[PDB]
Design a protein around this ligand. Structure first.
Ligand SMILES: CC(=O)N[C@@H](C(=O)NCC#CBr)C(C)C
Length: 129
């Protein structure tokens, strides 16, 4: 894409140790699955294309971008060591939306609906075995 968008977050790095855990399997098969298919998922399914959206200040404000397309690839490609790393990515994605946009805004209402579902699912994250 455009030279004016940053490179997306890392989804592959052989030097980073990786593990499958039951919690990570739940984050893919239950959490990501549930949120990905939601009516309001679409703005979150790929990195923000600030050029196409005409938001030249986006990556001036948001220095820790994250999106569910990146999280999906991280889960599918077993990038994580533990569930906390993945939960942090989700939280970063929501917080970026809340920081950049105004409380009224459609995108915020959408993020808040996804976050409510996320919280319900994470309260049932299974005990690590
Ligand atoms: C969710 C987030 O981080 N911010 C959104 C944003 O840049 N503004 C939405 C509007 C306008 Br004009 C992005 C996901 C599209």
């Amino acid at each position: 894409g455009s030279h004016m968008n940053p490179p997306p977050p890392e989804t592959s790095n052989p030097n980073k140790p990786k593990r499958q855990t039951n919690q990570l399997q739940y984050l893919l098969r239950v959490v990501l699955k549930t949120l990905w298919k939601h009516q309001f998922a679409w703005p979150f399914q790929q990195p923000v294309d600030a050029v196409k959206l005409n938001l030249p200040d986006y990556y001036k404000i948001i220095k820790t971008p994250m999106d569910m397309g990146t999280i999906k690839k991280r889960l599918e490609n077993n990038y994580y060591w533990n569930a906390q790393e993945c939960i942090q990515d989700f939280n970063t994605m929501f917080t970026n939306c809340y920081i950049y946009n105004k409380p009224g805004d459609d995108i915020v209402l959408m993020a808040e609906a996804l976050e409510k579902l996320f919280l319900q699912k994470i309260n049932e994250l299974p005990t690590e075995e």
